[PDB]
Amino acid sequence: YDIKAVKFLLDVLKILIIAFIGIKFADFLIYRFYKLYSKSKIQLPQRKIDTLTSLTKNAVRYIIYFLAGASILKLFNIDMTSLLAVAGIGSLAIGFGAQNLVKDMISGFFIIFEDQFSVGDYVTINGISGTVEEIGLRVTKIRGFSDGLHIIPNGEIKMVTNLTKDSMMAVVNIAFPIDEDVDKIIEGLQEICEEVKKSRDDLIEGPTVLGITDMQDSKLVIMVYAKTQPMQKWAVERDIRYRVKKMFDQKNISFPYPQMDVNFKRV
Amino acid sequence: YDIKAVKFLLDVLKILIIAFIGIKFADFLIYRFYKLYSKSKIQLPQRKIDTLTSLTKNAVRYIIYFLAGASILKLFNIDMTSLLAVAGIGSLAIGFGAQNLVKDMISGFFIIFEDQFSVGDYVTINGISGTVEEIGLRVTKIRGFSDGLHIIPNGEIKMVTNLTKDSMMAVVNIAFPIDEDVDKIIEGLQEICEEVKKSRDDLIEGPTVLGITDMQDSKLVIMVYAKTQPMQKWAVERDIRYRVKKMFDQKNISFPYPQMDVNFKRV
Amino acid sequence: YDIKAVKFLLDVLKILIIAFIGIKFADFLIYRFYKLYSKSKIQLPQRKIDTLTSLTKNAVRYIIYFLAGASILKLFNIDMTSLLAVAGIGSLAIGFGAQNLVKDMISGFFIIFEDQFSVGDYVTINGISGTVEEIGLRVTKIRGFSDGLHIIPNGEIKMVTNLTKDSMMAVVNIAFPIDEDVDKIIEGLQEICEEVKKSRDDLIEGPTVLGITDMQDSKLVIMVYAKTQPMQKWAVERDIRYRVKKMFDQKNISFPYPQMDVNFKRV
Amino acid sequence: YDIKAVKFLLDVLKILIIAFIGIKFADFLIYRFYKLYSKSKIQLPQRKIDTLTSLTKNAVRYIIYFLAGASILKLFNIDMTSLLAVAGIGSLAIGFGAQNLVKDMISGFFIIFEDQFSVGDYVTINGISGTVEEIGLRVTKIRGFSDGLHIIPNGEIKMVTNLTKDSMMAVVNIAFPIDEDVDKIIEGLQEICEEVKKSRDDLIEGPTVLGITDMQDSKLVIMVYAKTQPMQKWAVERDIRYRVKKMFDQKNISFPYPQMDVNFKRV
Amino acid sequence: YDIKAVKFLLDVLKILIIAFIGIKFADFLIYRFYKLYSKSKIQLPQRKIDTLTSLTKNAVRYIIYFLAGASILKLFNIDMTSLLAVAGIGSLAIGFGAQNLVKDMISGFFIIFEDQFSVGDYVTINGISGTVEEIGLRVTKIRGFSDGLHIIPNGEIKMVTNLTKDSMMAVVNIAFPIDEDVDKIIEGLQEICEEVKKSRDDLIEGPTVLGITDMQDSKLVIMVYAKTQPMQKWAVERDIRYRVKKMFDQKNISFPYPQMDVNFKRV
Amino acid sequence: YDIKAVKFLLDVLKILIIAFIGIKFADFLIYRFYKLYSKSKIQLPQRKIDTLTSLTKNAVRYIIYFLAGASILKLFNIDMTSLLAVAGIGSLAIGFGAQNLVKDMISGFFIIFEDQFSVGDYVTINGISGTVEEIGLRVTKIRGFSDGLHIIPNGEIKMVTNLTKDSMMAVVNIAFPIDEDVDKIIEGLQEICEEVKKSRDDLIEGPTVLGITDMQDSKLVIMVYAKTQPMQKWAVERDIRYRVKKMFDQKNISFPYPQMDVNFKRV
Amino acid sequence: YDIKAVKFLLDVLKILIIAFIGIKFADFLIYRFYKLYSKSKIQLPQRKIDTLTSLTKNAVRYIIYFLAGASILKLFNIDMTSLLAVAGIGSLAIGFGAQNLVKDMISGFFIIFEDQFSVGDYVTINGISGTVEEIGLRVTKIRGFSDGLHIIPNGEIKMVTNLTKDSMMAVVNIAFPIDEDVDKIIEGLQEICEEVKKSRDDLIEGPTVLGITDMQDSKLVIMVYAKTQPMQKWAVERDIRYRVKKMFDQKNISFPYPQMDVNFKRV
């Protein structure tokens, strides 16, 4: 007439005392990871830490409940494989929904750690470009000129192209009619290059004229370029453009107006 | 002649009393999570809470049924691995169909918690732009001017670019014929910048003229820009455009009409 | 000389009596879930319910067969892990092919439950727009003007933008030559706004003229807008367009004809 | 000196007699599911059923071999988890390669069961449009006018838009110069609407003129529309187009020729 | 002082004799599946069968090694779950990398079995079109006119549209100026239809004129169509085009030259 | 007072001697698979084989460590399921990161084995075209004319279209004004066909004129085509183009200059 | 009255002493893998190594905690399958989030090992082109002219096309009016080819004229090409362009101006 109900009550008593120990233990650890991060009130307000700490506490309570519960269910002869094919709906949903969060974190870790870019560089990252403002661990902030502030999760960084770095390149493609006199234009472009090499202090390499970079229908295109100091690219381009307009005027050279020629019939 | 039928009836009696205890226990917990969320009738109507609470109750009944059932099946010597390869069709279908729901909730949690944007900012989020109206946990609402109200699930937020924030940037690209007189145009643009810096109180930085931002075929393009107070961008741009038309008129300057030039043959 | 063949026949007899019990039990449950949903013949015809109920019954028969079978196979010393790596082909194929069905259902549940839109609103949902006609749980129906009836599964709803709701916005972008007289045009547009504010009862806000919304090459574009009652947007726009044509006529103002200017050589 | 070799030979004898029983059992079931589907020679030729039945038989033979084999391997002390990590290559490859097949079947089941469309409707399904010819369970056939016969697997049906159904809408967008006389044109369009309302019997709603649906550069566009009987849409549109050309002729109205205006310099 | 070393050596001896038996057994089965497929040298050269058979043999050797090895490792008290988390790297990599192969085979099976197309039809399959040359089980070959020979794996077949089949449709959209005389043109097109109905034997339905299929700016488009025998579509279209050019000539009708009209200022 | 510490030390001694045996065994196998592949120094340099063999050795050391370790951890009563949920992070990451590698190898195996193309054919493969230079097992090399050398991993081959093979097709679409005289042009094109059939030895089929392949606005297009020897396509097309220009000259035929016709107003 | 509490305290003492041993063991191994990589301060600063080593240490502490903890939880009768469905959320999230890291490493290994490109070549890799600056194991650095520095993770390398290598090809497509004299133009192009073959030392093959590579509307296009030394392509093209402009001038040949011809009506 059975004396195993003893081992039974022993076990359910073990599960209960261990779940209690675990709960108090965890409320202690959450309170400590609380107060230690609470008085050095740097990275977070006591409104966020509150909701975050409450969130941690609730997660640990529910986990501990589920565990004690399924263990005690095991004791009343419920099958743990069926219990697994039910709890595994949550294992799967959460486990996979969280993978983006983990991808963000790993990616961010390498962005920060490989110094792919620092809190001031101008970068183009996934078709969007701007000046980096914050580098978080999960998320990166980047303010374009006029574009507004872009907030990009780190997992979404396919390629990150960094302008700046070891200086930028400024480039102007100026187009003339094919029609036109090449050597005159090229000599005038070089005069602009010299005037700008003297007149600026942000440029490290150029300006330089390199040949006919392109030829098509009724226009031929020549390129001037120049290595500039970080964030000066556009200033230099705008300057070169102004001077090129001026040189179109003084040197009396035709503008690259589109140029058709038509045959006539009257009827 | 066997005296194990005792341990057998003992077991199936344990499964049944535990499934009963679990069902009553859960109907109690659902009734409490019911009435506690029921008289503080804030976020939900008693039509929604009804269907939602009925839904929870039915899910717990079906889970408990499945558990008791598979355990009793285990008792009649049915294999739990085959039972698993059957129940796992549901574990997989539900577990993965729900991963979007979980992704939404994680993403939403970070949107709210990192204050990526507040209930008033103007944001562009996945090619769609508008003024945010609700920030849920699963879903975000965003009303574009004329666009209608966009409802976006949170898991679908690749990048969220926020305009507004620390002020916007207003930009006008005005285009003149290459043909034209640069310094006159630039000086007049600066007169418009001064008149607008005086004439407005929403601007915090500009307006400012920066050089020849672009040059092509028969037009050259100059840019004025100006940091404005949140949501004033467009007002400022429209103002600057009006003034620039006016200045085209008074200063007598040619409009940037497309400009071909054609050669003739008669035949 | 063995007396375990007894426990053996006992077991296979247990598996058989349990599979029998399970089959009768389920044909009973299917017959009840049948007749209860059968005389309240609302949502389904007795041709659909027949094929659906037959389908349920066959699924339960095949599952029960597979279970009894794999258990009896376990009894003749067949390994349940190899049996698992065979049955798991079906666990995987079905479990994952069904995940879209589950995704549809979850999504649909939230569409209905968050009242994202009701059986009358005009919505644009994944590049397709129309008037919603049915809101199912798995699938949504939406009839565009001329487009035909679109049937969209719920899992395919990335964003659902809802026009209507708290009223629509009607917008007309009218374009004039840059060439033209701005204040005359604007005053005339305001006369059209006043005449339409008087002459209609669907509009709740506009009409209103806001500045030069755009300026380019040989055209400048002005915008009139107006908040209208649900589904009136287009009536209002068509009206404003008519009146704007009329105002081009009476006020004698040039149409925005594209405007080149060409230089001549003869040869 | 061991008397367990008895239980050993007993076991391998059990695995063998059970694999034999299983093979004969299955060849019987395949032969019956053969002859029963063989004399009602409706949906399949005895060339297809032959290769399909041969295919079923071989699959069951190979599965039964693998099972008996891995069980006997278990008996010579081979580990079933390593055996699992080998067989699972096939469990995974097949299990997942077959998921499209399962997706097709589920989708098709719902297409047929929700009567999303019947064997005659004209549907646009994933950018492709045509008249449905067969509705299978795995695959749908749809013949476009001139397009050829499209065969679409059911799992690939994102949205299925069905034209026809509760009648179609025929739409003509006729464009006139802005230049032109609106009320004359509108009255003439209404005369065409009346003449067509009289002259046809396939239309159920229109034809109707609704206002200036669009206005741009040198054209303004008016829309006539009309609900028609299934598959008459295009007949009605072609008719309305013919009559509109006729009305351009008789009423002497200018065609919407693109309309530039150009300024001259000679040089 | 232990007499279990006997059962130990017994076991490792069992694993060894079973791995030996399995290896000889498999080399026999590979040699037979070799010579049986070797003298009926149809589908394969004895250079392919050699490398394929060698490949099979090596796979079976390595699998048998891994099995015997992990079993003997189990015997020296190595844990099979850790062994599983190592071998499962290969289970996963291979199991999933092979899923495309399995997808190809399933898809190909259905293409062949549902006779979606035969070794002569002209099909468009995933944006690519051509005449089918081989129908494999894994891969399909399709030679476009000028395109070269396309080799498409079967798993990549989303939709397969088959032209040919129950005949093709040939279609010519001829465009006239709006300017023009409709009934003359239509009557002339019908004369071309009659002359071609007489003059060909590949057509089964047309040719036929159906109305104004389109109207825009300065062109109106009329469509002639005709059901033709498989692969004749293009011959018919080219013939109809030639005849339509001839009819433009004889009947003296204006070609659909783009038609602007321009206003002049001199300055 | 326990005499199981004996079986304990026995076990950990078994794990240690088996890990030692396994390590020496593997360093031997690596040294042999080393020296055997080392003196037939064909496919690899002794710098690659060094780093590759060192890599193999380190992988086997770490695997053997992990196994011995987890087994000894099992002995001190550490749970192997928790150990599994930790090691499985690596099982998953590696197992899935390697699936591309396996996909490449399978695909490459079939490319090589089905002789889809050989080391000289001109192929277009995923939008990129070129002449194949190497066919590896993991990766394929393909050098475009001017394009540079493309290196494509095998798993990335959706479709591979092979030009060459049973000869190429050369195609020239020449366009004339609609305006023009069709039979003259066609007869002249045939004279070019004959002159080229005589004048070349790389062509196997053409050249041939087939009708009006296209008719539009102000141009009608005729096609000449011809089956050529592998890699001659372009030579033939270039030749036919030259001759067609020559024939435009001699036969005095109008070029297909775009052809508008304009109406005039002065104001 | 139980004497198993002895084996109990024995076990938990075993778990504790093994977790202690493992912790000290690991802090030792981390300190060694620290100091050995610390004084050879090459690839890393002692700021990075610090944070990386601290990171390793913390990871191993948390893993060891989780293990000891779950083992001791197993001892108080907590179920390890439920414990597995909780820890598996992390196994899944981390295991899958890290798969990109693994993919990068494998890919990079093959890039380095197959010398697909070296630290100087000019490559186009996923639509982005530039000169390679660093080849890491996880990530590749590539600086475009003007483009800025692109940092690409290795897993994102679909195809990597390498220009340079066995020399580059420089290509110029020059276009003339159809109108024009072909043999004159071709002979002149050949004179430019000869002048450039003499005048350069970077070219290894060309320059060479090959026929009418293209013919259309009012232009015909001829191609000159030439194999050049690595990185000279563009110099050569720019030179050939300059010379071709010069040759348009001297030889007096018409530029390829777009060429319409128009018919007149006055009204």
CB B58 within 8 A of CB B27: no
Check whether residue E156 and residue E206 sit in a common domain.
no
Q: State the amino acid at position C112 in one-letter form.
A: I
Angle between helices B99-113 and C99-113 (to 10 degrees): 50
Count CB pairs under 8 A between chains D and E. 199
Check whether residue F178 and residue F100 sit in a common domain.
no
Cα–Cα distance, D145 to D130 (Å, whole number): 7
Q: How is residue G4 written in tokens?
A: 């198993």
Cα–Cα distance, F256 to F185 (Å, whole number): 13
> Which one of F115, F141, F157 terminates a domain?
F115
Residue where the block lists tokens 């009839």: C143
C-alpha distances out from residue C39 to C34, C53, G77, G267, Å:
9, 14, 52, 79
The CA distance from D1 to the nearest CA of chain C, in Å, is: 18
Sequence-distant (6+) residues with CB within 8 A of A114 are G139
Nearest CA in chain G to F244: G215
Check whether residue F120 and residue F103 sit in a common domain.
no
Total count of domains within chain G: 3
Q: Which of F18, F220, F263 sits opposite E78 (nearest CB)?
A: F18
Query: By the CB < 8 Å criterion, does B213 face chain A?
Result: yes
Q: How is residue C60 written in tokens?
A: 């339960």
> Where is F62: in which H helix or E strand?
helix F48-75
> Where is E236: in which H helix or E strand?
helix E233-250
> Where is B187: in which H helix or E strand?
helix B182-199
Check whether residue F29 and residue F101 sit in a common domain.
yes
Cα–Cα distance, B4 to B11 (Å, whole number): 11
Residue where the block lists tokens 């959209």: E173
CATH number (domain holding residue A11):
1.10.287.1260
Sequence-distant (6+) residues with CB within 8 A of A132 are A117, A118, A119, A120, A121, A122, A123, A140, A141, A142
The CA distance from A116 to the nearest CA of chain G, in Å, is: 8
> Angle at CA E102, nearest 5°, toward E96 and E108?
150
Q: Which of B96, B178, B215 sits opposite A92 (nearest CB)?
A: B96
Q: How is residue A83 written in tokens?
A: 């219990």
Count CB pairs under 8 A between chains C and D. 200
Q: How is residue E137 written in tokens?
A: 């089980």
Task: Please choose, from the candidates F238, F63, B112, the residue with its C-alpha nearest in 3D space to the C-alpha of residue A48.
Answer: B112
> Angle at CA B210, nearest 5°, toward B208 and B216?
140
> Which one of F94, F115, F136 terminates a domain?
F115
CB F25 within 8 A of CB F18: no
Experimental method: X-ray
Q: How is residue C51 written in tokens?
A: 């094929």
Domain hosting G108: range is: 1-115
Task: Please choose, from the candidates E223, E147, E262, C55, the residue with its C-alpha nearest in 3D space to the C-alpha of residue D241.
Answer: E223
Cα–Cα distance, C26 to C29 (Å, whole number): 5
Check whether residue A7 and residue A86 sit in a common domain.
yes
3-state secondary structure of F220: strand
- CB contacts of G92 in chain F (<8 Å) are 92
CB atoms inside a 10 Å sphere around CB G260? 18
Query: By the CB < 8 Å criterion, does D245 face chain E?
Result: yes
CB E92 within 8 A of CB D91: no
CB G169 within 8 A of CB G226: yes
CA E65 to chain centre: 39
Q: Determine, yes or no, domain membership for C259.
A: no
Cα–Cα distance, G83 to G79 (Å, whole number): 6
Residue where the block lists tokens 């189990």: E74
Cβ separation A85–B81 shorter than 8 A: no
CB F129 within 8 A of CB F89: no
Q: Which residues of G188-205 are buried (b: 16+ CB within 10 A; e: fewer)?
A: bbeebbebbeeebebbee
| Annotated resolution, angstroms | 3.4
Name the pairing type of β-strands D139-144 and D128-135. antiparallel
> Where is F186: in which H helix or E strand?
helix F182-199
CB G168 within 8 A of CB G227: yes
Task: Please choose, from the candidates G216, D59, E75, D92, the residue with its C-alpha nearest in 3D space to the C-alpha of residue F245.
Answer: G216
C-alpha distances out from residue G115 to F34, F102, G135, G162, Å:
22, 20, 11, 11
Q: State the amino acid at position D151 in one-letter form.
A: I
3-state secondary structure of A38: helix
Residue where the block lists tokens 């007049």: B188
CB A145 within 8 A of CB A196: no
| Mutate: best of B81, B176, B265, partner C, most C CBs <10 A | B81
- CB contacts of A90 in chain B (<8 Å) are 95
Task: Tell me if there are at least 3 CB pairs under 8 Å linking chains D and C.
Answer: yes
Sequence-distant (6+) residues with CB within 8 A of D121 are D131, D132, D162, D163, D164, D165, D230
3-state secondary structure of D1: coil
Residues in chain B: 267
The CA distance from D126 to the nearest CA of chain E, in Å, is: 10
Check whether residue A55 and residue A123 sit in a common domain.
no
> Taking the CA of residue G73 as centre, how many other CA atoms within 13 Å lie in the half-sphere pointing to its CB?
25
Cα–Cα distance, F69 to F78 (Å, whole number): 11
Cα–Cα distance, F165 to A38 (Å, whole number): 74
Q: Determine, yes or no, domain membership for D266.
A: no
Cα–Cα distance, A93 to C102 (Å, whole number): 12
Cβ separation D262–E267 shorter than 8 A: no
Task: Please choose, from the candidates G233, G171, G172, G245, the residue with its C-alpha nearest in 3D space to the C-alpha of residue G203.
Answer: G233
Cβ separation C153–D159 shorter than 8 A: yes
Cα–Cα distance, D262 to C101 (Å, whole number): 61
According to DSSP, the residues that pair with F124 across neighbouring strands are: F129, F161
CB C142 within 8 A of CB C123: yes
Cα–Cα distance, F255 to D170 (Å, whole number): 42
* Residue B161 burial (10 A CB sphere; 0-12, 13-18, 19+): buried
Q: In chain E, at which residue ranges do the beta strands (DSSP E only) sit?
A: 122-125, 128-135, 139-144, 148-153, 160-162, 168-177, 208-216, 219-228, 261-266
Q: Three-class SS string for F195-217?
A: HHHHHCCCECCCCEEEEEEEEEC
Cβ separation F218–E82 shorter than 8 A: no
CA dihedral for A226, A230, A232, A234, sign (positive or negative): positive
Cα–Cα distance, G209 to G171 (Å, whole number): 10
> Where is A208: in which H helix or E strand?
strand A208-216
Q: Determine, yes or no, domain membership for F266.
A: no
Cα–Cα distance, A109 to B177 (Å, whole number): 51
CB D81 within 8 A of CB E85: no
Cα–Cα distance, A176 to B112 (Å, whole number): 54
Q: State the amino acid at position G230 in one-letter form.
A: P
CATH number (domain holding residue D209):
3.30.70.100
Q: Determine, yes or no, domain membership for A263.
A: no
Check whether residue C149 and residue C182 sit in a common domain.
no
Euclidean distance between the first and final Cα of chain E, in Å? Answer: 121
C-alpha distances out from residue B79 to B13, B64, B76, C20, D95, Å:
20, 19, 9, 16, 21
Check whether residue F38 and residue F17 sit in a common domain.
yes
Q: Determine, yes or no, domain membership for A2.
A: yes
CB atoms inside a 10 Å sphere around CB D201? 8
Cα–Cα distance, E238 to E171 (Å, whole number): 10
Name the pairing type of β-strands G139-144 and E122-125. unpaired
CA dihedral for E241, E242, E246, E247, sign (positive or negative): negative
Cα–Cα distance, G44 to G47 (Å, whole number): 8
Scan residues 130-189 of F and list those with Cβ closer than 8 Å to G.
138-139, 144-153, 156, 174-175
Q: Determine, yes or no, domain membership for D261.
A: no
3-state secondary structure of F233: helix
Phi and psi, residue D200, nearest 5°: -130, 160
Angle between helices E80-97 and F48-75 (to 10 degrees): 140
Q: Determine, yes or no, domain membership for B267.
A: no
Cα–Cα distance, B249 to B247 (Å, whole number): 5
Cα–Cα distance, F167 to E107 (Å, whole number): 30
Check whether residue A159 and residue A185 sit in a common domain.
no
Cα–Cα distance, E167 to A75 (Å, whole number): 71
CATH number (domain holding residue F161):
2.30.30.60
Sequence-distant (6+) residues with CB within 8 A of G211 are F238, F239, F241, F242, G222, G223
> Taking the CA of residue E19 as centre, how many other CA atoms within 13 Å lie in the half-sphere pointing to its CB?
21
Cα–Cα distance, E144 to E124 (Å, whole number): 10
Cβ separation E212–D242 shorter than 8 A: yes
Cα–Cα distance, E66 to E83 (Å, whole number): 11
Q: Three-class SS string for chain G?
A: CCCCHHHHHHHHHHHHHHHHHHHHHHHHHHHHHHHHHHCCCCCCCCCHHHHHHHHHHHHHHHHHHHHHHHHHHHHCCCCHHHHHHHHHHHHHHHHHHCHHHHHHHHHHHHHHHCCCCCCCCEEEECCEEEEEEEECCCEEEEEECCCEEEEEEHHHCCCEEECCCCCEEEEEEEEEECCCCHHHHHHHHHHHHHHHHHHCCCECCCCEEEEEEEEECCEEEEEEEEEECCCCHHHHHHHHHHHHHHHHHHCCCCCCCCCCEEEEEEC
Cα–Cα distance, G158 to G151 (Å, whole number): 15
According to DSSP, the residues that pair with B209 across neighbouring strands are: B224
Sequence-distant (6+) residues with CB within 8 A of A198 are none
Q: Report CA Rg, chain F.
A: 34
3-state secondary structure of D112: helix
Q: What is the DSSP string of B37-69?
A: HHSS-SS--TTHHHHHHHHHHHHHHHHHHHHHH
Check whether residue F161 and residue F176 sit in a common domain.
no
CA dihedral for F51, F52, F56, F59, sign (positive or negative): positive
> Where is A18: in which H helix or E strand?
helix A5-38
Q: Which residues of D60-83 are buried (b: 16+ CB within 10 A; e: fewer)?
A: beebbebbbbbbbbbbbbbbbbbb
3-state secondary structure of F142: strand
Nearest CA in chain G to A111: G151
Q: State the amino acid at position D257 in one-letter form.
A: Y
Q: Determine, yes or no, domain membership for B242.
A: yes
Query: By the CB < 8 Å criterion, does E92 face chain F?
Result: yes
Cα–Cα distance, B48 to B31 (Å, whole number): 15
Q: How is residue C234 written in tokens?
A: 């287009």
Q: State the amino acid at position A102 in one-letter form.
A: V
| Mutate: best of D47, D62, D89, partner E, most E CBs <10 A | D89
Q: In chain F, at which residue ranges do the beta strands (DSSP E only) sit?
A: 122-125, 128-135, 139-144, 148-153, 160-162, 168-177, 208-216, 219-228, 259-266
Q: What is the DSSP string of chain C?
A: --S-HHHHHHHHHHHHHHHHHHHHHHHHHHHHHHHHHHSS-SS--TTHHHHHHHHHHHHHHHHHHHHHHHHHHHHTT--HHHHHHHHHHHHHHHHHHTHHHHHHHHHHHHHHHTTS--TT-EEEETTEEEEEEEE-SSEEEEEETTTEEEEEEGGG-S-EEE-SSS-EEEEEEEEEETTS-HHHHHHHHHHHHHHHHHH-SSBSS--EEEEEEEEETTEEEEEEEEEESTTTHHHHHHHHHHHHHHHHHHTT--------EEEEEE-
Scan residues 50-69 of B and list those with Cβ closer than 8 Å to A.
63, 66-68
Cβ separation F211–E248 shorter than 8 A: no
CB F19 within 8 A of CB F67: yes
Euclidean distance between the first and final Cα of chain B, in Å? Answer: 121
CB atoms inside a 10 Å sphere around CB A265? 12
Check whether residue A248 and residue A151 sit in a common domain.
no
Phi-psi category of residue E164: left, alpha or beta, with phi > 0 → left and psi -120 to 50 → alpha: left
Q: Greatest CA span in chain B, whole angstroms?
A: 121
Q: What is the DSSP string of A209-231?
A: EEEEEEEETTEEEEEEEEEESTT
CB A255 within 8 A of CB G252: no
Subunit partners of chain F (3 or more CB pairs within 8 A): E, G
Q: State the amino acid at position F200 in one-letter form.
A: R
Cα–Cα distance, E245 to E175 (Å, whole number): 11
- CB contacts of B128 in chain C (<8 Å) are 159, 161
Check whether residue F19 and residue F109 sit in a common domain.
yes
> Angle at CA D83, nearest 5°, toward D79 and D88?
150
> Which one of F104, F136, F165 terminates a domain?
F165
Sequence-distant (6+) residues with CB within 8 A of F205 are F167, F226, F227, F228
Cα–Cα distance, G108 to G124 (Å, whole number): 16
